[PDB]
Amino acid sequence: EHLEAVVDQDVQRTCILHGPVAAQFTKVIDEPIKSIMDGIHDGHIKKLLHQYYGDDESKIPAVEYFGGESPVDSAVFKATSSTDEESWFKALAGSEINWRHASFLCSFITQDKMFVSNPIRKVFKPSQGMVVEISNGNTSSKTVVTLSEPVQGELKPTVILKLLKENIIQMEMIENRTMDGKPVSLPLLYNFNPDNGFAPISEVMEDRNQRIKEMYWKLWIDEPFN
């Protein structure tokens, strides 16, 4: 890859690797990587359609987002001492493939090209006293979740998971031990990218610290926000 750095630019001086069996297919020059990978893929697609799917696409299944599966309706759930975690996250992710299917199962979120543990599988981590409820568990656009836990003995909504316009997630994370006593909520927004099954969920880092600060204001300050 550096002929310029040789005696007379002749390559026959050079050491280059290759496969004797593979050269039987390497004949076209400098074609795009995507072009050839796609050629391969679509060839496989034809070879599978013609056999297992009658060469009619619609015969195909479909999915919100493809990925995340390791090789290994309006209800509630109550976690406890040994409430199993993966069972919890299945119950709460459900069965359909949607943003919710990932939220509890997608282990990683992207922060502008940085992959980090899911905060949700952290918070919702099963424990004692925690009780959560689901509504519209069938339809996703309105499928929502509400977790409450012991606040001074009593239970109160600590978390609200829901969808938005634009295929967005928001966790309204609530804190009720408050100056005025009344609770406050924190909108944590997440973009959904089903086209990226491995990580369709990407946190939005814009205005973020501002939201956090507006929370902490009322948590701490008897004044407006500026």
Binding site: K34, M37, I45, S70, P71, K113, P194, F198
Partner: protein
Amino acid sequence: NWLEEYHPKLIKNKSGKIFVETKFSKLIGRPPLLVPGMTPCTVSPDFVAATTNAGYTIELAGGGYFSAAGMTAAIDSVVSQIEKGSTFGINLIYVNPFMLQWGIPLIKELRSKGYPIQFLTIGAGVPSLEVASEYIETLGLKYLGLKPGSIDAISQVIN
């Protein structure tokens, strides 16, 4: 029956895209194809980047870097070249500890930070249970790769 439990299936995505479903393509929302770590070729960050941007997993050529920073610069470059949520992995070596002692204690940190790396690949060798262990708990790694041409290497990975 290996022909059904591992039957090669098909998938359609919301975007209307086709996918080939296997036990592997389904961890990655990406076809069951990739590129192995190749020192002269999978070392060029721009190339690996333009490839993964096509949506095909890749190994990075650790062997093309004689340091703990050059490869780091290549990382920070591809990062600057890929799209959000994209991803790739590296290829190390097991016969050149010096080619190795850089990455492992560096891989660990890049993950502790949360770089877009999601898989390792040891080439031209195979480790032991003892060593091979930490790679899967300490490393913020999705999966792992191995390059056996032997038969006992295979028994080893099975261990």
